[PDB]
Design a protein around this ligand. Structure first.
Ligand code: NI
Ligand code: NI
Ligand code: NI
Ligand SMILES: [Zn+2]
Ligand SMILES: [Zn+2]
Lengths: 346, 346
């Protein structure tokens, strides 16, 4: 079979390998239909940053059960599934309480072990999530990214009837925008430096957009006046300036979910820090995309939205293609910005 | 009557002045029995932190109603009261929603108007909170400071059965320690650079103490392992280093209430910021000390705790004296830092 492997840095080869076999009673083999590229893979490929090389990445994928171990009885050949890439231990105090993303002894498909840029993959049963027969299998590769946004909403106790503000119009942000609309947010506002990403977000249901290269935080807070109550702000860009921005625009008692990891230090003036207190913000750190019971309601809601077609995936997809097409397109972007979602369709 | 007045650049003097008269129908006059100096008064006195000069400070006081305005029918001369120093407008959107501390046009006794370092004061009916007949009147001057920590607990949906960690062992933090113990925290931990203040904390029922000048954040976290869950951390020191420490030591899904205001900028490393996401912390900005119905359950609870003698005030008190010893004790803070509560007793 084929697979995409990248080595000490840059080089993305397309490889031939022995079909992987089931080696534990709790494993299943998946035949992969759709597998997408993540923002987090770019560093692993083009800035070192991967746990080892050569490696096979890919943790956003769907497909069909091809075989199951002697111990799995609730799955069967033909069953549609999406990959659940994190594997917590399930038995430590964090896991018992449902804090799987704070488990210290973890594996992760496509990072700590090879992933789904491949024709077949063997994973633990725990690492697949059954999908309805009625969901287009290809959209299955979007479930893990969608759950990023839903997990933040879950932590905030839901986006319903709230004035949600999404900061960052990348795939995560844009998926969050569509979910907020589908789940009955009172309003959805999108904030980004690109007027193009913003128009896109507007086409997804954001009733208004703020271009943060043109509009001031005050300017924004001014526009936000009528919707300053019950805010749920999602910071998805992961840069000091947008974390700072979220705090400065925040309405009274706004919830602030951080899903974006920083790679530069955060410098909050005493004034900005003061606004966290003065406004009585609740800042919610969000990690990964899971809850109890495993893998979490986030995965059911995501699956449901996808099956009842409330989401619009095409404008998010930059590339469809098999192993060479995908490899090349991955090489094309390099250390630059990701156009949109790059899908591997074997 | 006498009062204590501060002029520019640390000038402290005791003035003679005419007793205030009721001037609006909803006012009351209070003859003050006990009036304490707050940590936030220090910058107002020594570091040009006051809105105007000269000022009469004092927002932590109790006394008896001396007279009531024509429109007040629920209080009478002789009634024991504590001052509720914040005066929201009660008619803006924030106020209608109980966000009194986010009211944009609020007054504040001892900050935006002259306060209770004086024999008598005229304030609005909404600026006083009736005390029980039994309560020793001096204790009423602690109600306001007690409610600060109670307000952080309230925002965190309570301290019951939580492992609370109070960072900062000044008056505010030490009272929060006592309140946590009385309200049924599973455990209380105190953290401060002063071994002597930690012994004090331990006497108030903090089961263990960490000296932040002898112990690293990692070493603190190691000891906290068994108490890592259901943490409620109050940051009361208001310096960048203790805000950083609270995120660094925090256990999985800890609640961090920020009560201490910063007067320096906060520079957070990406790693530190990273931990807010990774531990899925909830960071709770706390402001002032009120909730609905005005002035809040905080006030009911503070009064009850005092009346049932669950609190220990004496070991928190550094100075008792009338206008001259009080004025001098304030001047002495310049060179001899504020080791405890300074009470003006007229
Ligand atoms: Ni991803
Ligand atoms: Ni800085
Ligand atoms: Ni105070
Ligand atoms: Zn675990
Ligand atoms: Zn108001």
């Amino acid at each position: 079979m084929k697979s995409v492997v990248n080595d000490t840095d840059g080089i993305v080869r397309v490889a031939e390998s022995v079909i992987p076999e089931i080696k534990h009673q709790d494993e299943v083999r998946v035949k992969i239909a759709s597998s997408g590229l993540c923002g987090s893979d770019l560093p692993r490929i083009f800035k070192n940053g991967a746990h080892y090389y050569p490696i096979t990445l890919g943790h956003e994928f769907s497909g069909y059960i091809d075989a199951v171990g002697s111990g799995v009885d609730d799955l069967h050949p033909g069953d549609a599934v999406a990959c659940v890439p994190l594997l917590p231990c399930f038995t430590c105090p964090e896991c018992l309480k449902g804090f799987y993303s704070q488990c210290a002894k973890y594996d992760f498909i496509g990072s700590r072990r090879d992933g789904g840029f491949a024709e077949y993959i063997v994973v633990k049963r725990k690492n697949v999530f059954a999908l309805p027969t009625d969901m287009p299998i290809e959209d299955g590769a979007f479930i893990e990214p969608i759950t990023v946004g839903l997990h933040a909403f879950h932590l905030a106790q839901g986006c319903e009837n709230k004035n949600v503000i999404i900061i960052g119009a990348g795939t995560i942000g844009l998926l969050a925008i569509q979910c907020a609309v589908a789940l009955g947010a009172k309003s959805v506002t999108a904030i980004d430096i690109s007027s193009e990403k913003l128009a896109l977000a507007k086409s997804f249901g954001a009733m208004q957009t703020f271009n943060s290269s043109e509009m001031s935080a005050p300017q924004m807070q001014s526009v936000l006046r009528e919707l300053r109550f019950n805010q749920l702000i999602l910071e998805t860009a992961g840069v000091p300036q947008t974390v700072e921005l979220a705090v400065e625009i925040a309405g009274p008692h706004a919830q602030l979910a951080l899903v974006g990891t920083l790679h530069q230090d955060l410098h909050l003036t005493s004034a900005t820090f003061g606004k966290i207190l003065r406004k009585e913000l609740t800042v919610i750190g969000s990690w990964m995309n899971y809850s109890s019971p495993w893998p979490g309601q986030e995965w059911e809601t995501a699956s449901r939205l996808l099956t009842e077609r409330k989401l619009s995936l095409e404008p998010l997809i930059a590339h469809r293609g098999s192993f060479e097409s995908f490899a090349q397109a991955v090489r094309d972007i390099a250390r630059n910005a990701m156009p949109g979602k790059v899908l591997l369709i074997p």
